[PDB]
Amino acid sequence: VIESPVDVVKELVENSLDAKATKVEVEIVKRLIRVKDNGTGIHPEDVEKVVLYSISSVSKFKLRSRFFQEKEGKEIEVEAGNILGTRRVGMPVGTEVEVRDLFFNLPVRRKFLKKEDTERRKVLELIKEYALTNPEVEFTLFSEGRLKKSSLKERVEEVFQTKTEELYAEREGITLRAFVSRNQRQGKYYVFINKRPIQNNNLKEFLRKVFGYKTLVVLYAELPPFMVVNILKERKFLELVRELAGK
């Protein structure tokens, strides 16, 4: 399930969000993964139990959590799934997790790990997907320096460092919004159907044709009862995408 550091930060950030956090701070060094949390935190009683929620606790793992109605907070150090110890720790309400030397104990899986720059790009892409999906949540990413963005509405412009034209179209159940910037050096086409990102190549080429190439297109779709690769009732969706590319 883990296989690489982007899957670690994915599990930890997903947990942070389920914990109702409005601020997520991710740090990587290429090896440390650290996810700091704004959320409800974990009862001291439950910290051991949740360390055996989080497995990926088998690589050199440390977690501290303070529950929002508790005043202390609790830290547990485990190594390759073996608890090394615990201590009570002063800290703000929330959760911090440090992963540190992923697959130190499993050399063959450690040798599956890519170049450090590749893993850095996978993490960066994941964090910007979470940001583009959650405008109301602050996100921060530390690689060596700082990546940083706050509560917003159009954070598309912050993420992609460009101004954008906003387009809106709605028909039957389908609601979709686009953010487009036409001068780009390279075209980049991002699609989110509901909150889930869609990597489909055919759809991206349809956006290349309908909004033109060498353009940034960020598409947000909302539909109620559909599948998710994913299927829907396609013709009306696609001619809606054409319709709002007609501004």
Work out how close the CB of 161 gets to Na ion at its nearest, in angstroms, rounded to a whole number. 31
> With binding defined as CB under 5 A, does residue 98 bind Na ion?
no
> With binding defined as CB under 5 A, does residue 85 bind Na ion?
yes
Work out how close the CB of 95 gets to Na ion at its nearest, in angstroms, rounded to a whole number. 4
Nearer to Na ion, 89 or 238 (CB): 89
Per-residue burial over 23-58, b = 16 or more CB atoms within 10 Å of its CB, e = otherwise: bbbbbbebbebbbbbbbbbbebeebeebbeebebbb
Residue 156 to residue 128: CA distance in whole angstroms: 9
Nearer to Na ion, 70 or 77 (CB): 77
Residue 217 to residue 167: CA distance in whole angstroms: 10
Work out how close the CB of 184 gets to Na ion at its nearest, in angstroms, rounded to a whole number. 37
Nearer to Na ion, 87 or 114 (CB): 87
Which residue stretch of 22-30, 71-79, 142-150, 166-174 sits at the interface with Na ion (rule: CB under 5 A)? 71-79
Work out how close the CB of 203 gets to Na ion at its nearest, in angstroms, rounded to a whole number. 34
Distances (CA, A) of 183 to 46, 95, 157, 159, 187: 52, 42, 14, 16, 9
Name the strand (E) or helix (H) holding 114: none
Write out the residues near Na ion by the rule CB under 5 A: 15, 19, 77, 85, 87, 95
